[PDB]
Amino acid sequence: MLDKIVIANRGEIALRILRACKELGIKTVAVHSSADRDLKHVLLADETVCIGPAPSVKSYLNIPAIISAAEITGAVAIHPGYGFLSENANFAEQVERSGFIFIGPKAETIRLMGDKVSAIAAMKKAGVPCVPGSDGPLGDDMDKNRAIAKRIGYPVIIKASGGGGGRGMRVVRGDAELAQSISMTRAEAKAAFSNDMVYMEKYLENPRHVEIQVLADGQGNAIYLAERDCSMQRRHQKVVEEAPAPGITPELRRYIGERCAKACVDIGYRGAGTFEFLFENGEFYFIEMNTRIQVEHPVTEMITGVDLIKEQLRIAAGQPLSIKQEEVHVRGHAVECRINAEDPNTFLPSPGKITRFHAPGGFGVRWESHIYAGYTVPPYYDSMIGKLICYGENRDVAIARMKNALQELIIDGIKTNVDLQIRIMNDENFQHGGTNIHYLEKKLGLQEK
Amino acid sequence: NFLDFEQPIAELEAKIDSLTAVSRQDEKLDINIDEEVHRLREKSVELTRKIFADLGAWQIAQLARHPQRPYTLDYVRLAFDEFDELAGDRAYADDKAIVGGIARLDGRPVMIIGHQKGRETKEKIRRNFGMPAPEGYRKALRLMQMAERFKMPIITFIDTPGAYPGVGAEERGQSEAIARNLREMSRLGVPVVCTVIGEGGSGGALAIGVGDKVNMLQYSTYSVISPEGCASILWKSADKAPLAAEAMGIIAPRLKELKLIDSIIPEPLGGAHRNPEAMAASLKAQLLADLADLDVLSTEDLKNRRYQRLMSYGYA
Amino acid sequence: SWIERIKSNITPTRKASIPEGVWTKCDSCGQVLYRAELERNLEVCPKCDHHMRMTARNRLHSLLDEGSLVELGSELEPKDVLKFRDSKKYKDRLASAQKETGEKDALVVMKGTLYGMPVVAAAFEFAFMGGSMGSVVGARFVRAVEQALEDNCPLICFSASGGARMQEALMSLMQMAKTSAALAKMQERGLPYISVLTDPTMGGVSASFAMLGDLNIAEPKALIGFAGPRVIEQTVREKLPPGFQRSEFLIEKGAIDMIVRRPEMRLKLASILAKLMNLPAPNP
Amino acid sequence: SLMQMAKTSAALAKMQERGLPYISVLTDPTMGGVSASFAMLGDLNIAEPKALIGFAG
Amino acid sequence: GHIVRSPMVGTFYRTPSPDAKAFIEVGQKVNVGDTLCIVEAMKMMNQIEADKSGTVKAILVESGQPVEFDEPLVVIE
């Protein structure tokens, strides 16, 4: 067992990791910035280390500072969580060679899977279905690009293979702007992810975002938990998840779980990861793999009883998988609604000071956040200020509990996206279950006279 | 940023460009954009044709110095590829008014030397509005020698208002540098082709323009002295510059009929600034055609032919 | 009440053992870096893009294609004949540098091949007493020139020298003229020669063949001149201009052709040599 | 007349590789095109005192 | 007055060598350009430089005790 690890993150996920560590009896090391000196998990930790000033580049993206903090405190492992250095393969390599243990996949698999084109090629090599497309970054020949697009079928989309975070991808409607769109997408990928590689893939109009969480110890063991569904996306970023998904009968669930387990075995995967897909009339299309603890992890714990962070801490400690395929039981349903400090409509972040805070509480309500009375939201990082789950017995029960909790939930002093959450809950199609990915955008509408 | 006589075209283009934005501007307006844009473009094209049907030597000068026009860098980017810029005169500085380098064209490496003016005001200040200091001419001499050494073709451009009449230029042997250039370039063993893109002349520009072939654009002027200077000297008045331009014959047809150049390169309608890509295509085709036949000649016979064409200069 | 909690000090002593050879420093910026990463980035600090020292043989490996390295004139070694009497005996410094750098002299010669085009290369190891040009250096350069003349191919030399080897006295100075004669011989033949100015290039080598090739390619923030800045400071007893003798400044003053960073250097050299030799461009 | 500069330059280049000297002397004044064609191109540049020499007036 | 703070996080020392003299002394004044202590990180002993001249009022740190960013080390008046 890892005697003492480092919370290489901040905020909600930092607090969650801290709670899990204190549960498992593992001591805590808190690394923070100078602005986040009153974080909940920072105050609830034995050892607090400040490794930079307010900006992210100088403080949390400062890999030398994190390794220095892990050296001075005597840790033997580091947990990145999600975001920041979650998928930095070089970070994994340095931590492995620095003398500590990286809680996550080996850096080789990070390189192979983070780059989208390589991940798709490997998935096709393992037999996992993928979107037909270029299967390689295209050049400056418009004729080749349009020929490939006609081969796969318009419309088409250009996405940065080293891209992520809901940016660095542009959709192409026709050849009248294909070259310019590809060039500007390459420029954006250069400006964001330090890579110019951009590829072409078939674009769908009516998809259903289906993703499967999986676990593997890298020793020939691969287990898959229940599915997920994030149909309510805004700007390609999730706002309301749910797990398991409607319509996915256990036959298809087992059928795709076996394939994902075989893929993990073939790649020799380690740690907690999820294989995203695209669902339509029984067809799945892998597009990306997130080799980290996904943010919408709770909607899988509550429907299976298995703590993901405990699984990661045990796997990183070298212990084999303590849970087998038949020992995973899917019992229930869940809904999750993130809370962000942005503007409800204009989507402008609204940092400041929180005046009144009050958790929902109740049967099946699980409120993951670090905000508290007087906590000053820093204008320096992501706008997320908490997650919220309402585990029910069926989807309708979960929706009702979420409505009740949102009525109970009170956050005052800054702008919050609770109103949009209430509107989403009240929607009939959403309550029915099975809406398309763009459903949110159709409900968004457009300009007016 | 347009000239005086371009007002009918200017007004309509302030409405055509908006319609693309009006397609999703506000208030849910997605009007029948296509047909209105096509009609407005038809009207603008007809007005431009009518306006540029009437052309004048002053208008020729204005189009030659329209503050939107492809410079040497533009023609290199839109007609050549694999351009590697070489700088430095080895002596004192690298004057920005001349841009030189080595590039490949249809698999054949070439030496490209030509003046560059600049689009923005800051770039124009930095490049001295295309007025070359003598060190730039020394750099051009060095590049021409290097191209001569490795059996390399030379193609040069001439777009400059005139050799810089500054204190430093005169202090540093302006005339000496130009003479040194003009002596060596008559001994090169490789063909030399030159173009009169933009506005060029004043004699100083000839230090990179004595070769087997000379070509001019349709709206370019190549005079011994500037029309304003010619007016202020001969007519004792600056405002009589259009009269001096008409008398001189700085326009392209006049310099073509005087058997001083080879051919006039046509421009896209609306001048070069309206469709710089078509102008670049025409220039690329013309230079490729000119370079094709010239490469047959051997170096000794090439120099002899150049010397005979050198003797062909002048009326007597 | 964890809301109001003070910060206690970290454990005063815990035994932590990081491997010693996986971290370096950049005095130019201060960002600690991973040694293997930096070595994989051609000795460029990725944060501030400030070039550092590189082994001469490492530079040759970086430029020349693997499977074609052929060292030329490796038999020559320092054969001191002057018996100089400094504060230390010249043999002391000679032996120290020879046993430290593992190379016979400053210059290292390797005939290689670049993208299918044969090419000769050379480089100065700055750690060899400031990379001073010995008689072996000039003779090896002449050997490379002879190989280029008998086997037609461009020659490339990368300059890094603190000045002429004083302990060889006038003999090293004549090597400047010898290399100049070699350059003149091969320049009328038509075989190019591209000298690249590293950090730093001063003294005699700066004025013998570093600043005499067909191209003058400098690497950013390199100190290039003829006399060290301290000598000029004691001469004019004043302040040097800002950014004195920097590649950015010396390309402004026209003595420098172009500024090329090391990662692009291989492709840029291949393209320029292919164009000048009129050969087909390399395929990338 | 501008092309005459190049013609004279060609003549000078022809006779300079032969080895026959050519000494241009700059009187008062020497300006304009001639100053930059063969006045400032000979083996010697001998000026006469208090003469105006340049390229532009 | 002005108090110097370590810009990095790591082990703190006062003598650059295991057996040597500390860079500065309490009492006797120091200038703008001077090294005052060592904050070692990853076995790479880096130096700490003040920015204002004045008398050393007091030293608020002890050898061998790790410090972090924005940590007042020595106050200079």
Ligand SMILES: CC(=O)SCCNC(=O)CCNC(=O)[C@H](O)C(C)(C)COP(=O)(O)OP(=O)(O)OC[C@H]1O[C@@H](n2cnc3c(N)ncnc32)[C@H](O)[C@@H]1OP(=O)(O)O
């Ligand atoms: C007249 C001549 O040609 S030799 C005169 C010396 N050189 C010059 O005047 C030109 C530049 N002068 C210099 O001092 C340097 O070369 C500078 C300015 C580039 C500074 O570079 P630095 O980083 O200071 O390098 P530095 O001078 O320490 O060179 C490293 C070593 O090479 C030695 N070295 C450098 N050039 C020479 C030389 N020409 N002869 C003998 N030893 C030399 C130095 O003594 C030094 O040895 P050490 O570290 O064991 O004491």
Ligand SMILES: Nc1ncnc2c1ncn2[C@@H]1O[C@H](COP(=O)(O)OP(=O)(O)O)[C@@H](O)[C@H]1O
């Ligand atoms: N090929 C595709 N067709 C349709 N939608 C897609 C496609 N690829 C991505 N998307 C949309 O974008 C979302 C994020 O895609 P992903 O590749 O995971 O990017 P990121 O790395 O930014 O999360 C998906 O959930 C989906 O809604």
Ligand SMILES: *C(=O)CCCC[C@@H]1SC[C@@H]2NC(=O)N[C@@H]21
């Ligand atoms: C590394 O192995 C331990 C050496 C660290 C520095 C040493 S230990 C204490 C000595 N005094 C001091 O200021 N630094 C010296």
Ligand SMILES: [Mg+2]
């Ligand atoms: Mg994703």
Ligand SMILES: [Zn+2]
């Ligand atoms: Zn650096």
